[PDB]
Each structure stands twice: as structure tokens, then as C-alpha cells.
Design a protein around this ligand. Structure first.
Ligand SMILES: [Hg+2]
Ligand SMILES: [Hg+2]
Ligand SMILES: [Hg+2]
Ligand SMILES: [Hg+2]
Lengths: 103, 101
């Protein structure tokens, strides 16, 4: 297991990161998180679905709708790509700080 | 951040492994070591001393009265916790590095 405190800081950035690869939807995103982390991080549904809500409200992603049978898909916005890049730079600084002490 | 909250204690324990220390000196060493990138707040630092001591990870002792300075020394359990948090950090970096590029 990993730091809950750090991961809380990066949930949105991790979801944005997957959306930069391609448009996606709730179940695919959480599936992709656990698989790509080698099972080290499995995201809670409540964590995931309040993140979408926040990401949308903030204007970092947009919803759209598949065919009726309707699935909600998200696509990352230019404003969401810029938030992602800021958080990437932040992660680099965060790492630099903690690697000094935690060796 | 609330991100650094996860490793405040481990940062203090790390300095304590290099030697006994006290509040002003721990704070200065953080400033210096990070070259200003991290400066711990006085409330955060005294909270962490208090929690570390509650948890049995450090012990306080006292200098001469000149008021008396409060020193801390890491315990064997403090070292155990430190090394589990190092492993955790490496795993954390792995996870976040997977996405944040
Ligand atoms: Hg594990
Ligand atoms: Hg992928
Ligand atoms: Hg270590
Ligand atoms: Hg380690």
C-alpha cells in the first residue's frame, strides 16, 4: 500500500492523465487505474464520481452521451490539459522535496 | 499541501536519524535541505512532535536551564516506522509516475 494523503492530491490528475490518452467512462477509468498500477491503487466509486463532478464543474472535462440502450463519456478540455501540466510540475517539486529526506 | 501531510513525520524522523535535534534546528534543516522549497509551519511542527511522541516514535529530553531546550531522540520503533514509510513512498511514486508525465 501507498500514501492515502498523496493520492488524494492526485486523483484528478490521474483521471485527466487517462483522458489525455482517450475519451473514457467511469468503469473503464477505474479499471484502468487498478490495472496500470498493478493493483496498487483501486479507486472507490464515490471518490471517482465526485472527481468527475468536480472536474466538470471546474471545466477540465466535458461529458457527452453514447447511444441509447446511454453511457456518459468524458473528454479532457484545453483548460484541463493546463491544470494537468501544473500538477505535473507540482509532482516533480513534491518528489524533489520528499526524496531529500525519505531515502 | 495536504500532500506533504503524509510525510511530515517521516521528514522529521529522517533528520532525527542523523542526530538528536530540537524544534528550531529541525525547522532550519528543512529550509536548508530543500533550499526553501519546503518551510514547515510552527503549528505543523509542534503537532508532529506531539504525535510522534504519543506514537512512541521519539522521546523528549531537556537541556540546561538558560527556560530549557527540548530535545528529541528517535526510538527503535521510530526507525521501524521510518523504514515502512520509505517503502510506502517508493510505491506511491510508482503509482503517480504511472500517470503524471
Ligand atoms: Hg503492498
Ligand atoms: Hg494505456
Ligand atoms: Hg529509508
Ligand atoms: Hg525505502
Amino acid at each position: 500500500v501507498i500514501s492515502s494523503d498523496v493520492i488524494r492530491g492526485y486523483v484528478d490528475t490521474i483521471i485527466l492523465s487517462l483522458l489525455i490518452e482517450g475519451d473514457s467512462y467511469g468503469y473503464e477509468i477505474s479499471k484502468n487505474i487498478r490495472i496500470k498500477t498493478d493493483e496498487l491503487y483501486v479507486i472507490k466509486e464515490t471518490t471517482l464520481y465526485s472527481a468527475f463532478a468536480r472536474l466538470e464543474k471546474n471545466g477540465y472535462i466535458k461529458s457527452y452521451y453514447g447511444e441509447e440502450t446511454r453511457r456518459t463519456y468524458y473528454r479532457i478540455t484545453p483548460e484541463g490539459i493546463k491544470y494537468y501540466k501544473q500538477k505535473c510540475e507540482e509532482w516533480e517539486l513534491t518528489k524533489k522535496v520528499i526524496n531529500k529526506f525519505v531515502k
